Design an enzyme around this catalytic site. Structure first.
Site, PDB file in Angstrom:
ATOM      1  N   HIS B  43       0.812  -1.222   0.000  1.00  0.00           N
ATOM      2  CA  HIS B  43       0.000   0.000   0.000  1.00  0.00           C
ATOM      3  C   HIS B  43       0.856   1.288   0.000  1.00  0.00           C
ATOM      4  CE1 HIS B  43       0.239   0.407   4.534  1.00  0.00           C
ATOM      5  NE2 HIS B  43       0.232   1.676   4.167  1.00  0.00           N
ATOM      6  N   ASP B  99      -0.685  -7.331   2.052  1.00  0.00           N
ATOM      7  CA  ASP B  99      -0.064  -6.018   1.938  1.00  0.00           C
ATOM      8  C   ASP B  99       1.468  -6.165   2.005  1.00  0.00           C
ATOM      9  OD1 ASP B  99       0.194  -3.306   1.745  1.00  0.00           O
ATOM     10  OD2 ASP B  99      -0.533  -2.885   3.805  1.00  0.00           O
ATOM     11  N   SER B 197       4.036   2.898   8.142  1.00  0.00           N
ATOM     12  CA  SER B 197       3.579   1.788   7.305  1.00  0.00           C
ATOM     13  C   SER B 197       4.743   1.300   6.485  1.00  0.00           C
ATOM     14  CB  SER B 197       2.463   2.256   6.342  1.00  0.00           C
ATOM     15  OG  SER B 197       1.216   2.289   6.988  1.00  0.00           O
TER      16      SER B 197
END
Ligand SMILES: COc1ccc(S(=O)(=O)NC[C@@H](O)[C@H](Cc2ccccc2)[NH2+]Cc2cc(Cl)ccc2N2C=NNN2)cc1
Ligand code: NA
Lengths: 10, 251, 29
Positions: B43, B99, B197
């Site tokens: 992502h 992911d 992230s």
């Protein structure tokens, strides 16, 4: 905010 | 990272900053798994709902860093991307299932006191360490609250029972995810947050004294909310894909 | 797994421990 990185990398 | 602390020098030498070339900004964390391969969250590279679809030339990785903003002359190394690989079944439409993404560097990065790869887990390492209550460690230069750190932040967080993860959220959880963080009644706090992230969730094996990356910072609803948990990509569950890419496209 | 993976030059390689790794070990019950 971020210090300039050497232009060779860009 | 929320409610973490300053990392020690060389405490996380596999830490990688994913850095946008122009405008020059932090996009995500990432990790060094060999002298030419970097692991991160899909992502961070591909998210159609926000018109995110980076190519190799949009990005740099910065390895060996401690300070967030400074150019760490003679310490950090900055690498260009040869190629990006996104998991073909990454589910950006629904819940960020799988992911995960790999980035191959144009040239090998030289290892140093500040630059060193993390291990990826075997089946037996995952079975032994991925247990509720067992703590892992999350690192990143993300925000301090749902503002920005001077240096790399670190927080240790317990893995959470799967029913408790499921019951915390309306998002459909999969076997390719695990959640981590303290409960409201545990008192202690901590979470990843914006900018973290793609970075690593690591554990130190008590069997062989080596650090293994068990997770990738994937998603969370806000940061450090009571009754909410961070969700991490389950690295061992996707290691077959990782090895496939490296075996095919590694030199 | 890579020969030397997961061993940090400034910690494991020199037998130094970081400030919070014991918290991890203590959780591996
Ligand atoms: C398509 O799947 C989705 C799954 C979850 C969500 S969400 O929970 O509504 N939002 C997650 C988002 O804040 C972020 C991940 C993300 C970034 C960009 C595009 C899509 C998803 N969460 C990152 C994160 C991870 C962890 Cl372990 C802890 C905290 C956070 N966080 C929350 N805010 N900022 N960072 C959205 C889509
Ligand atoms: Na929480």
């Amino acid at each position: 905010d971020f210090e300039e990185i050497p232009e060779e990398y860009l | 990272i929320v409610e973490g602390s300053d990392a020690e020098i060389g405490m996380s030498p596999w830490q990688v900053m994913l850095f946008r070339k122009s405008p020059q900004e932090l996009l995500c964390g990432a990790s060094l798994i060999s002298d030419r391969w970097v692991l991160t969250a899909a992502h961070c590279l591909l998210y159609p709902p926000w018109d995110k679809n980076f190519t190799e030339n949009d990005l740099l990785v910065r390895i060996g860093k401690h300070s967030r903003t400074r150019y760490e002359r003679n310490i950090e190394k900055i690498s260009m991307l040869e190629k990006i690989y996104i998991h073909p079944r990454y589910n950006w439409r629904e819940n960020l299932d799988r992911d995960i993404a790999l980035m191959k560097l144009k040239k090998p990065v030289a290892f140093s006191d500040y630059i060193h790869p993390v291990c990826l887990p075997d089946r037996e390492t995952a079975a032994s360490l991925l247990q509720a209550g067992y703590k892992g460690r999350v690192t990143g230069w993300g925000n301090l609250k749902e503002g920005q750190p001077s240096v790399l932040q670190v927080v240790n967080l317990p893995i959470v029972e799967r029913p408790v993860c499921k019951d915390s959220t309306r998002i459909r959880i999969t076997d390719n995810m695990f959640c981590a963080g303290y409960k409201p009644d545990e008192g202690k706090r901590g979470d990843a947050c914006e900018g973290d992230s793609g970075g690593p969730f690591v554990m130190k094996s008590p069997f062989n004294n080596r650090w293994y990356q068990m997770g990738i910072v994937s998603w969370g609803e806000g940061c450090d909310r009571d009754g909410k948990y961070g969700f991490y990509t389950h690295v061992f569950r996707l290691k077959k894909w990782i090895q496939k890419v490296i075996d095919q496209f590694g030199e | 797994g890579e020969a030397d993976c997961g061993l940090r030059p400034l910690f494991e390689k020199k037998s130094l421990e970081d400030k919070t790794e014991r918290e991890l070990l203590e959780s591996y019950i």
